[PDB]
Paper text:
Human angiotensin-converting enzyme 2 (hACE2) has been demonstrated as the functional receptor for SARS-CoV-27,8. SARS-CoV-2 cannot infect standard laboratory mice due to inefficient interactions between the receptor-binding domain (RBD) of Spike (S) protein and mouse ACE2 (mACE2). Deep sequencing identified three amino acid substitutions, N501Y, Q493H, and K417N, at the receptor binding domain (RBD) of MASCp36, during in vivo passaging. Cryo-electron microscopy analysis of human ACE2 (hACE2), or mouse ACE2 (mACE2), in complex with the RBD of MASCp36, at 3.1 to 3.7 Å resolution, reveals the molecular basis for the receptor-binding switch.
Meanwhile, the atomic structures of hACE2 in complex with RBDMACSp6, RBDMACSp25, or RBDMACSp36 were also solved at 3.1–3.7 Å. The same as RBDMACSp36–mACE2 complex, the interaction region could be divided into three patches, the three adaption-mutated residues (K417N, located at PI; Q493H, located at PII; and N501Y, located at PIII) were located at the three patches, respectively. However, in PI, the substitution of K with N at residue 417 in RBDMACSp36 loses the salt bridge interaction, which would be formed by K417 in the RBDWT and D30 in the hACE2, structurally explaining the reduced binding affinity of RBDMACSp36 to hACE2. However, the third substitution of K417N significantly reduced binding activity of RBDMACSp36 to hACE2, rendering a lower affinity than that of RBDWT. Interestingly, MASCp36 showed decreased affinity to hACE2 as well as decreased infectivity to primary HAE cells in comparison with WT SARS-CoV-2. These experimental observations were further verified by structural analysis in which MASCp36 loses the key salt bridge interaction with hACE2 when compared to WT SARS-CoV-2. More importantly, Cryo-EM structures of both hACE2 and mACE2 in complex with RBDMASCp25 and RBDMASCp36 define preciously the atomic determinants of the receptor-binding switch: N501Y/Q493H/K417N in MASCp36 formed tight interactions with mACE2 in three patches, respectively, while K417N reduced interaction with hACE2.
Residue numbers in the entry:
A (entry chain E): 333 to 526
B (entry chain A): 19 to 612
Write the structure that this text describes.
């Protein structure tokens, strides 16, 4: 009956780092995507497996909103079948992705003079991620054969680095807040519709 | 697992760390350059020291990745560019002495001041005192005084310093398995391990000598005509068959010959093209000039400037309140921050410089996708050549007539393009023999093909066989005349300018042979020709990921410095010079001296 809490997902001030993206679940409510479609301030509103129009008149059992902040030149990697640092190490979208990727420039908040080093991406991983699997584990990355013993050294690297977000960065390096909606269907009755 | 994957991971980490720290260092240096304050100097020096220390540490951690076990070529290029340890390969004492010599050279050059033979207290520096003396005085004796005084004040001061500099840089270079420091510098044009596109470091010397041999007729005709004009401007002070005086070449050291234009113009009555008046008459400003240059670049399909360029670049002097070092410079601060710093006065020269610096920035945007170590010109001469071809295209009367800064009432008759070509040759064909000779002498010094006591004895020897320049007064060996140059004193490679001059005309001929331009080459206008724009962008986007020979062939179709485009560009001028010089002795005799 109530309006699905999309606002607090979008109105929020703190988005996660891409490596530790936030998952929020939306259910048991009537969802209004009209503001999402007609906002026209998003710099990337790409819907996969569903059309922007018909999704409003469509029923789902669960929605997941994955919030994080990335570069602009990496928003393309938030798309099914893409390959890169963000796609493989940090956040993986499945090939059969059935949601909408939304991304807006946020150079004003998420970038400050001297660098905003609060947003981290996982620069290295042993193996590429699976769909919708989070990897916050911060073991030292062993490039070579010698073990690291939890210290920095040859072939041994910290698996997290930070976008030194600054307001004067280029548009591809400017921070971009990305909310990824993923729609799900089960045998249980649908709860996200209207 | 393998060494190659480990090196790939190492360079993956280095890319991000270097991007961050280089952005910080360049941002601090920018904030200083726009606002000269001592706190800004502190920020700049802190960030620069951080960057240098990070480079040293990463070079150390990179040297434990052997190159002989890398099969990838981009990774090999990055590792080679990172593993060169530089002065760190030397011991601490000798390295500190070397850095001391470098800083003493920089200070001696940048602070030396010459004084009149009567007023030793109130006197003048190189800039703008000696600068204006050389660029405006028609007095032979004043120029001779300025020249001899500056050569015997800064050159003599730097001579033992230059001896120590050379003999320690040989140690530094051979410690990196280089034949000399000259070989170390030529290691920029060197390509290895690519079949059909290799380039040895002596191959560069061969190519430069060959291209200069081909130029020598055109340069010699230009030199003869200029000598005739200076005959008519200085009757008794030049021989009719000899060379030119050193001090009397429009500049302190004869690098450019532009300041002879007024004394050598072919047709003084014809109005030289100058749309500065047509700019002030339409109330053009710096923003208008840079918007016009951006529109020109969009015409050839290259992307327009980023919004950050308009927001953050200093396109105009911020009044007299805050002082800035505003030599027009293009700044790729990294991470998408492209800027131009220039005190823009509304002028045709500044219009051309705006096109030049926007060409630099456009080239910088092109390879902004290459890994951090590969974000530079294919070699040292590509970046300024890509910058220069745009000024060439914009200076053409067709572009000016099309942009509304030149009235269609203007008529082009043989006289005006002869004037244009002579201006262009004084700028360009004047500096080629000087640059080639200076780098020849420097490489001979670094290799050791010259005993030290024979430096000047050989240096002013080759002036007579290469450029056609005599010393106004004899010099002993305590002189170090070349150090009077900004680049010889301050440890810079000077052949980048010769290579740049060749590549720019190669690029121009290639582009407006792909632009279907019919007519003389000096009328080459690339505007509205998206085909030439795409042709050049294909070269630009490479950075130095691919060999410079292959990148050059990507536009010209040749793997080497083709001198033919320059001669073709100056063909009308070359014919006119041949016609003009029939009553003069072309060729110079080395024996005559002042
Ligand atoms: C959060 O701010 C946005 C402004 O773009 C807008 O949706 C609204 O003011 C806030 N959200 C809600 C649900 O009110
Ligand atoms: C120039 O630098 C001084 C010292 O840091 C600073 O007070 C001033 O605001 C700067 N000027 C501008 C325009 O920022
Ligand atoms: C060399 O490495 C790059 C990435 O570092 C890779 O894209 C390229 O395919 C490699 N070269 C070859 C021949 O595989
Ligand atoms: C450059 O031109 C493109 C072409 O559509 C345009 O989208 C862009 O806004 C232009 N750049 C600026 C800064 O206006
Ligand atoms: C380029 O083309 C446009 C439109 O065709 C024209 O207005 C402009 O004058 C042309 N400029 C040049 C330099 O050819």
């Amino acid at each position: 009956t109530n309006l699905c809490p999309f606002g607090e997902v979008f109105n929020a001030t703190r988005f996660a780092s891409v490596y530790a993206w936030n998952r929020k679940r939306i259910s048991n409510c009537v969802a209004d995507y009209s503001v999402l479609y007609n906002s026209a301030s998003f710099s990337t509103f790409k819907c996969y497996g569903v059309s922007p129009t018909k999704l409003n008149d469509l029923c789902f059992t669960n929605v997941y909103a994955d919030s994080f902040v990335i570069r602009g030149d990496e928003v393309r990697q938030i798309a099914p079948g893409q390959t890169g640092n963000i796609a493989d190490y940090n956040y993986k979208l499945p090939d059969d992705f059935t949601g909408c990727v939304i991304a807006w420039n946020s150079n004003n908040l998420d970038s400050k003079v001297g660098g905003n080093y609060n947003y981290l991406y996982r620069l290295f991983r042993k193996s590429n991620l699976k769909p919708f699997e989070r990897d916050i584990s911060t073991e030292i990355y062993q490039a070579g054969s010698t073990p690291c013993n939890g210290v920095e050294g040859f072939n041994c690297y910290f698996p997290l680095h930070s976008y030194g977000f600054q307001p004067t960065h280029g548009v591809g390096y400017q921070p971009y807040r990305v909310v990824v909606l993923s729609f799900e269907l089960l045998h249980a009755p649908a709860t996200v519709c209207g | 697992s393998t060494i190659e994957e480990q090196a790939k991971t190492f360079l993956d980490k280095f890319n991000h760390e270097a991007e961050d720290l280089f952005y910080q260092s360049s941002l601090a240096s920018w904030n200083y350059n726009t606002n000269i304050t001592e706190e800004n100097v502190q920020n700049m020096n802190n960030a620069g020291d951080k960057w240098s220390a990070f480079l040293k540490e990463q070079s150390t951690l990179a040297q434990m990745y052997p190159l002989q076990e890398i099969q990838n070529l981009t990774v090999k290029l990055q590792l080679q560019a990172l593993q060169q340890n530089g002065s760190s390969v030397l011991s601490e004492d000798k390295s500190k002495r070397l850095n001391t010599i470098l800083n003493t050279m920089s200070t001696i050059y940048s602070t030396g001041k010459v004084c009149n033979p009567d007023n030793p207290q109130e006197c003048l520096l190189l800039e703008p005192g000696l600068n204006e003396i050389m660029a405006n005085s028609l007095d032979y004796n004043e120029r001779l005084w300025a020249w001899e005084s500056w050569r015997s004040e800064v050159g003599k001061q730097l001579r033992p310093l230059y001896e120590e500099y050379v003999v320690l840089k040989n140690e530094m270079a051979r410690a990196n398995h280089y034949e000399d420091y000259g070989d170390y510098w030529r290691g920029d044009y060197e390509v290895n391990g690519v079949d059909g596109y290799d380039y040895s470091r002596g191959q560069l010397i061969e190519d430069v000598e060959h291209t200069f041999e081909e130029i020598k007729p055109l340069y010699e005709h230009l030199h003869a005509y200029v000598r005739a004009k200076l005959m008519n401007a200085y009757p008794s002070y030049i021989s009719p068959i000899g060379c030119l005086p050193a001090h009397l070449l429009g500049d302190m050291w004869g690098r450019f010959w532009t300041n002879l234009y007024s004394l050598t113009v072919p047709f003084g009555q014809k109005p030289n093209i100058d749309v500065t008046d047509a700019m002030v008459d339409q109330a053009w400003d710096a923003q208008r000039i840079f918007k016009e240059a951006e529109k020109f670049f969009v015409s050839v399909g290259l992307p327009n400037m980023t919004q950050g360029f308009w927001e953050n670049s200093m396109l105009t002097d911020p009044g007299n309140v805050q002082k800035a070092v505003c030599h027009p410079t293009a700044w790729d601060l990294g991470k998408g921050d492209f800027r131009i710093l220039m005190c823009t006065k509304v002028t045709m020269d500044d219009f051309l410089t705006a096109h030049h610096e926007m060409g630099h920035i456009q080239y910088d945007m092109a390879y902004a996708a290459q890994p951090f170590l590969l974000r530079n010109g294919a070699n040292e001469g590509f970046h300024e050549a890509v910058g220069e071809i745009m000024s060439l295209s914009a200076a053409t009367p067709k572009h000016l007539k099309s942009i509304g800064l030149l009235s269609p009432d203007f008529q082009e008759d043989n006289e005006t393009e002869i004037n244009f070509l002579l201006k262009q040759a004084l700028t360009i064909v004047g500096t080629l023999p000087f640059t080639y000779m200076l780098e020849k002498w420097r490489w001979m010094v670094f290799k050791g093909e010259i005993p030290k006591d024979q430096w000047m004895k050989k240096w002013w020897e080759m002036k007579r066989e290469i450029v056609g320049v005599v010393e106004p007064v004899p010099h002993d060996e305590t002189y170090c005349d070349p150090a009077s140059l900004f680049h010889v004193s301050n440890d810079y490679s000077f052949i980048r300018y010769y290579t740049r001059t060749l590549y720019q005309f190669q690029f121009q001929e290639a582009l407006c042979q792909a632009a279907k331009h019919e007519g003389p080459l000096h009328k080459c206008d690339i505007s509205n020709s998206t085909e030439a724009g795409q042709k050049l962008f294909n070269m630009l986007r490479l950075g130095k990921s691919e060999p410079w020979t292959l990148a050059l062939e990507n536009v010209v179709g040749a793997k080497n410095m083709n001198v033919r485009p320059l001669l073709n560009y100056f063909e009308p001028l070359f014919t006119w010079l041949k016609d003009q010089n029939k009553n003069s002795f072309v060729g110079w005799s080395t024996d005559w001296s002042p």
